[PDB]
Scaffold this active site. Structure first.
Site, PDB file in Angstrom:
ATOM      1  N   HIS A  70      70.832  55.956 -14.425  1.00 63.27           N
ATOM      2  CA  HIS A  70      71.516  55.710 -15.904  1.00 63.27           C
ATOM      3  C   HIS A  70      70.625  54.666 -16.643  1.00 63.27           C
ATOM      4  O   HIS A  70      70.888  53.992 -17.368  1.00 63.27           O
ATOM      5  CB  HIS A  70      72.561  54.745 -15.328  1.00 63.27           C
ATOM      6  CG  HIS A  70      73.860  55.129 -14.490  1.00 63.27           C
ATOM      7  ND1 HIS A  70      74.471  56.434 -14.707  1.00 63.27           N
ATOM      8  CD2 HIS A  70      73.737  55.043 -13.225  1.00 63.27           C
ATOM      9  CE1 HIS A  70      75.130  56.681 -13.517  1.00 63.27           C
ATOM     10  NE2 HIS A  70      74.837  55.868 -12.528  1.00 63.27           N
TER      11      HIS A  70
ATOM     12  N   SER B  49      48.542  55.161 -36.990  1.00 61.80           N
ATOM     13  CA  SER B  49      48.303  54.663 -38.247  1.00 61.80           C
ATOM     14  C   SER B  49      47.148  53.426 -38.230  1.00 61.80           C
ATOM     15  O   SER B  49      47.360  52.653 -37.098  1.00 61.80           O
ATOM     16  CB  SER B  49      49.576  53.951 -38.671  1.00 61.80           C
ATOM     17  OG  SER B  49      50.422  55.081 -38.965  1.00 61.80           O
TER      18      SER B  49
ATOM     19  N   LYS C  34      50.050  51.327 -31.965  1.00 58.07           N
ATOM     20  CA  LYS C  34      51.162  52.055 -32.061  1.00 58.07           C
ATOM     21  C   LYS C  34      50.799  53.821 -31.978  1.00 58.07           C
ATOM     22  O   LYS C  34      50.078  54.127 -33.036  1.00 58.07           O
ATOM     23  CB  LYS C  34      51.989  51.842 -33.186  1.00 58.07           C
ATOM     24  CG  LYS C  34      53.139  52.874 -33.808  1.00 58.07           C
ATOM     25  CD  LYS C  34      53.841  52.409 -35.050  1.00 58.07           C
ATOM     26  CE  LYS C  34      54.541  53.271 -35.768  1.00 58.07           C
ATOM     27  NZ  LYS C  34      55.656  53.848 -35.154  1.00 58.07           N
TER      28      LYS C  34
ATOM     29  N   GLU D 102      57.864  65.011 -29.029  1.00 56.26           N
ATOM     30  CA  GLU D 102      59.017  65.249 -29.707  1.00 56.26           C
ATOM     31  C   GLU D 102      59.153  66.939 -30.059  1.00 56.26           C
ATOM     32  O   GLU D 102      60.319  67.457 -30.288  1.00 56.26           O
ATOM     33  CB  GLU D 102      59.083  64.528 -31.086  1.00 56.26           C
ATOM     34  CG  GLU D 102      59.285  62.995 -30.694  1.00 56.26           C
ATOM     35  CD  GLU D 102      58.992  62.067 -31.944  1.00 56.26           C
ATOM     36  OE1 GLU D 102      59.359  60.899 -31.764  1.00 56.26           O
ATOM     37  OE2 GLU D 102      58.848  62.407 -33.015  1.00 56.26           O
TER      38      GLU D 102
END
EC number: 4.3.2.1
Lengths: 450, 449, 449, 450
Positions: free
Chosen positions: C144, C265, C271, C278
């Site tokens: 979960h 970036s 990041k 995706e």
């Protein structure tokens, strides 16, 4: 960086049709940036001049797409830079591909829905006008694809027109939510330069502006409900196509498609394959497939922007093109098909009037059960006599029920049959005439809403 | 009839909930028959009396279903005959099971949609009011599930409320089309006895009457769009569930569900399984499944009525029961969850302010590209010095751009960061405040509707 | 003929990739026509020669499609006539576009599935290799999405490899039914010239020939099957993508994708947006959409041939290209990603060993429930003392249960924790090694198919 | 603890059918726990004897469910503790609901697939037997629902049987992967007690054991592919239903359903509504919906166990019951329907022989193109003379082509027409006979396999 990823990310192959809306969004944004003091007036006029030039290049079909262009946005940006130089870059200030692209898609869809509406209303009008002209035609009404009772051919045509009119109403509801400005939502948290979104709304001619930036950036409700509208419309067209394909068989022989909307062979000149109707029916699955894909794409995605959302474009473009073609083909089929009044009439049999025979007794006061039992007995008597119920003598009928009078002969008339249905929505001529007027008015209202 | 065939036609096992709307429809029809002269006042009175009794039986939970009953409709007709004799049979004059059942379904859905509307608006209200109370809370906004920039927690709650308000709007549109009287369409060509449909509309309280008998009998648009509305609503709930499920991980640590909507073990007391959210998420598939089935059921069917349409009931009942339960659980979850303002703020890092640093330059008139490059150089310089960008000296910044002034220190504040988004719809407090007001006004409008 | 209907009937716009299989199909048919006495030996020579030239024109990319070509079949037919004249027309004797098109699509799919198989097997092999090399890595196993019990990172990688191996097995099942020759079915009733279908099968290298001409012309089971296989495969990849996206968040910090499969970036160099994952996740919806469309297209169609069937090509082409790309991207992602053994190990906590503490008592005789209660007491005791359970003293433990001996210290070891799972399929190292060997043996067989 | 949640988590209303496989799974686990020393040889006796009792109760209809039972698992466990007390608790040792439930579901599906296989093969058998009996019947073969050319009625029946045998083949493939033991995967990381999984396999009669504990706990591939198998099977039945519904119309008049599988009115005693076929067709959508739901439920779920997976039960149960009923009804329909050889034969027209007229020239050495042109011209000449091609005089024919000889009369014979199709798979009698033989072999092999 990966070559395959790079190919997967390219959309220039299918998104060029967003050329003009993309330019419009940029013109509107440029004006807002100027008000915000990001661009000087001279810079704004140079950018607008350039953008207008690009618009004209696409309009005239002279725009030159280059190998480096991965999408329409990059292509328009490259061209503007070529035309006006470094100043072009300032246009990205405070703007994200996240709100720029969704703005482009909504403007594009708004324009497409306007076109779809025209074609849909034309289809409905075509059915309504044909119903008016052929209002005297009578044929069998089917239940479980078995002859049940006489109906006016026009009642059949209007049943399809009514359903399509609900699709038109849904189209209008969908358009209303699409006509909301998303530009100025930035990448996620809103535009950071206190940009004048009311100016963007007014310039781009949207009805209102988005309420929340995260929602505006990540929601694809407008794509989903456009696809739901399109799928239900296709279900209706698939039912109409099934009906026409069956009625056009040599077995039923009720109508024939024109050469323009059928296929055939010189070997069997009379055999007309309903290509047009099979194409229409099949597109229901093609459109439904797009609806299914986007729901699955959206299901379970977290906030806010995710690359998964890029699947929206191809689904929307396909469905817009499909509906545009399909609606026009349907209008052609309905307006140019040829009915056989002779065959429709010959399909009407006395057996289809047994219910009317019972109804005759009902209007004389005979209770439902007994009225039907008596009608059944007339049917059996006819059978044993080797004839049909419309040929039983009055004495024959009275032997079943003394309630049968000489006027019962009026039951055995197919026009009298359909004329019993005067209650609103029925197949009586007056009821059909009322529907035609009601639909003409609905179309007028929807036409002005569009 | 074949025994397997018969089992496949039986709907008594799930359609008994139409018992009341079925009786209601029959009372209205009996009254119309009287007006048409098919029933006398006395017959009408006897029929209505028997129908009242059946209603009372179902109400008291004493109605006796018999093994011979194929459906709720047959059960009620049999019971009426048992109660008042064969005059009960006159009630079917001019009426078909075809327009009688669709009338019952629309009556049932109108009622069910009123219930769903109340629960949906309560969920939205819950989100909006909590957004108002926690308006000062700030946490990371995510892009590709990577921390991007600070945003107000309230901006997040309201992003969901806005989407749900569109679902409420679609619910209203679907209800209007369901609120159209189909009764009096007969078997296919219309009602043969010039029955007063306006009287039927008034007695059953529908807003208008169906335009065409064949369409009214055979269309299931109302089921499809109810299922489309339901599916999109579930998509939104699946997204909110995904968000909350991730935020409740120990890794994120932003919030904890209440014990009422989670499960756990005494062996790991601090761990809570987002039971409720996983259930909500899974219902998107369940509801979508019903949408897919009815669309396929309807595809390619010819006019007019076909037995295939009987698949509608189970799909409608399941989705009505699913949304009713799910909306209430969602409201409970949003209402009772506990956020960790501490963890949300601790997640805010200086690195998430580089964009703001470039924007600072943009406001001073530095072109987009240059501002981005300047901020990048600042980020890289800080990396070389082993410090965070908010630690760079004004001198370090000026070496990158003389456009950096002493007021640049205001860029390194998370409240100042979110406060940049004053344009309508943004995350600045004033914009969040406007959103709450707009949504309160919207809910009021939709509830009045 | 209506221009819009003409365009809709036009497939030349997308069916050109069937160019080569169309020619191969014609070469085989020509050979059979000569055996049947429909073509002379010299005609056969000129026809085969012309066909080979057209094949070379397509491969060289110089083939000229003309506005009059409504499809690839018409295109090759026109070109052959331009090359050799009147005798070209004898090639269509007894053949129909109906059996020509299914023959082409099946040959295309057979070749495409061989390609997809190569990429699918490379993905599994990449996962298995990684599981072999990073076999000592232990991180949380999730329940979960909550930290449950320690597991080997390799067990996680192998769970994905096992599911994908079942996809490979289904691929083989689909390929077998695709490897059946439909050519010689004619338009509906079969080939009318007693054509030698065994010769056609042998020339085109199909495994067997279709049993019934009507079925062969009208069924698209092979399309549906391929689409169901592709959809379930995408579900698997969508789950793997979800896992890696979550694990790649800075909050989990377990791994980072390479620059080739992510976007970044300069403003936030740490990041990395997992756009490759995706993309992969999103393709599940795209592929599912094709499956849903074809099922709806086929539902309710009558016998035998219907124009509706032409929707098959675009759905197959899209899914073939989608699978070929996504599989290769997935392989690259798994091969090039970087894990943080440090963060995965740091994520393991004492609290996650409470179930092991109970198991320790179970092996010493204490019954299920009692062992569970005892462990719970230990957890609570540690809490009141503000310490972790591994810090509890032996007397603290004995006060709870005398079955706690000094060796209970071995419980508080994450390697000892995963090593309890030696039963087949568990996360113990021996089981993981066995899995690697089993998957390799499976792949060997599958590739040998 | 929320009430609505508890209601949503309950499954006792529909999962009781898992009562017996649940007990078998517990018996198998009990035995392994003993071998592992968790249970004494006498504790195994109390536990087993108690389970076998619960087994008898369920099979007697005497098992009593209580308001506290939320699912079949809890019911069987509550009951075990009532019969043997506290000791029943040791049964949970190292076992999880996660692996216990998937085990029950796979055992249940394995048994249900054996039953479905029996009904599916019986349907295929009925079609093939009917094809063998009615091999001399000839009727129109349809192209776009338009009469194309003569074919044997048996060719039509066998086209359906062939598609159904592919469904039977897929059923077997799905069963093989379902026949794999998941028990002993524990909650996530595997069984922690070194349980003898081979013993569990042998006891439960599985063909092999799951390879990876996390996969075995979280995958529902078996549910998805069972649903894919079911959906394609329903597509086939939906097509057969559509065909039979159309052929049963009074317009086509090729066949009539028996009273048992249709409905009718005393008012129109000759009108039979094909309720059975409509019911069968409608279930394609119902089954497809279950497939769609589970695919959407699984999409994007992370490892490992998530409550979302509980939607599997209702989807599987619904489709198992739907297929079981549908297949038997279809078998009955095919077995008892009545064909009209007269009407099927009467439907054959001379226009359907133009293709044969061209083939006649082809066999005489005239090229494809000119043969088609000549036939087309024959058709046109007949059309202008207002007669059918079989009535054109030989002189008329020769005016079109000298290659038309007196033997051309053999072309205008519907039996000669179908007999052209001797190439394997065609409609000639020898070809249809060969198909029946091949299908008998295939059915034999599929039945033997499982």
């Amino acid at each position: 960086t990966d070559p395959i990823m790079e190919k997967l990310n390219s959309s220039i192959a299918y998104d060029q049709r967003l050329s003009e809306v993309d330019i419009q969004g940029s013109m509107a944004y440029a004006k807002a940036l100027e008000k915000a003091g990001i661009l000087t007036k001279t810079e704004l006029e140079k950018i607008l001049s350039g953008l207008e030039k690009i618009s004209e290049e696409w309009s005239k079909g002279v725009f030159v797409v280059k190998q480096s262009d991965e999408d329409i946005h990059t292509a328009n940006e490259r061209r503007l830079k070529e035309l006006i130089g470094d100043i072009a870059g300032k246009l990205h200030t405070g703007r994200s591909r996240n709100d720029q692209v969704v703005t482009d898609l909504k403007l594009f869809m708004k324009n497409s829905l306007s076109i779809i509406s025209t074609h849909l209303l034309q289809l409905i009008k075509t059915l309504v006008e044909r119903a008016a002209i052929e209002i005297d035609v009578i044929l069998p009404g089917y239940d479980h694809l078995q002859k049940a009772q006489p109906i006016r051919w026009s009642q059949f045509l209007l049943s399809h027109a009514v359903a399509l009119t609900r699709d038109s109403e849904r189209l209008g509801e969908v358009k209303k939510r699409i006509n909301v400005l998303p530009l100025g939502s930035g990448a996620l948290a809103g535009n950071p330069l206190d940009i004048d979104r009311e100016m963007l709304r007014s310039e781009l001619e949207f009805a209102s502006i988005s309420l929340n930036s995260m929602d505006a950036i990540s929601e694809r409700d407008f794509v989903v409900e456009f696809l739901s509208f399109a799928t239900l419309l296709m279900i209706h067209l698939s039912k109409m196509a099934e009906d026409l394909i069956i009625y056009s068989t040599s077995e039923f022989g009720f109508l024939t498609l024109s050469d323009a909307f059928s296929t055939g062979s010189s070997l069997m000149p009379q055999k007309k394959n309903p290509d047009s109707l099979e194409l229409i029916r099949s597109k229901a699955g093609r459109v439904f497939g797009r609806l299914a894909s986007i729901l699955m794409v959206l299901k379970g995605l977290p906030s806010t922007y995710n690359k998964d959302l890029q699947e929206d474009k191809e689904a929307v473009f396909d469905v817009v093109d499909t509906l545009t073609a399909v609606l026009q083909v349907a209008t052609g089929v309905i307006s140019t098909l040829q009915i056989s009044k002779e065959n429709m009439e010959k399909a009407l049999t006395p057996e289809m009037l047994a219910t009317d025979l019972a109804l005759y007794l009902v209007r004389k006061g005979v209770p439902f059960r007994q009225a039907h039992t008596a009608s059944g007995k007339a049917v059996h008597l006819a059978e044993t006599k080797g004839i049909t119920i419309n040929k039983l003598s009055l004495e024959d009928l009275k032997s079943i029920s003394p309630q049968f009078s000489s006027d019962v002969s009026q039951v055995f008339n197919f026009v009298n049959s359909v004329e019993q249905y005067t209650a609103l929505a029925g197949t009586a001529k007056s009821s059909v005439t009322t529907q035609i007027e009601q639909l003409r008015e609905l179309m007028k209202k929807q036409k002005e809403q569009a």
